[PDB]
């Protein structure tokens, strides 16, 4: 009914974003493990697998977040990478 139409129209899915690490030929594998542990709360085993995905697949998804939180993860990870003088790029794509 009218109430039911109002309900339908308020069920637009959240805008979510994958946060992604992109491979490069200069960033140490150990540093990527560090990144995944420090900023994404991965245990060492899971961090190591994702890091290997970055290296062998070209990129890996670190997790999926609201747009606001995703932009905050990207900013932090890149800052941490630059201050350690690595080119590691963390970016976003809409899920």
């Amino acid at each position: 009914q009218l109430a039911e139409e109002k309900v339908r129209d308020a069920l637009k899915p959240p805008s979510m974003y994958k946060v992604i690490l992109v491979n490069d030929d200069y960033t140490p594998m150990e540093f990527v493990i560090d990144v995944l542990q420090k900023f994404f709360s991965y245990d060492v085993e899971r961090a190591t697998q994702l890091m290997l995905a970055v290296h062998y697949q070209g990129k890996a998804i670190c997790g999926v977040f609201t747009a606001e939180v995703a932009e905050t993860k990207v900013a932090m990870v890149n800052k941490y990478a630059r201050e350690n003088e690595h080119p590691l790029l963390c970016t976003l794509e809409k899920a």
Binding site: N23, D24, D25, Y26, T27, P28, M29, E30, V32, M51, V54, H55
Partner: peptide, 11 residues
């Protein structure tokens, strides 16, 4: 990415 130097077991 860059793999770390392996640490030799045998001397």
């Amino acid at each position: 990415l860059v793999k770390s130097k392996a640490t030799n077991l045998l001397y």
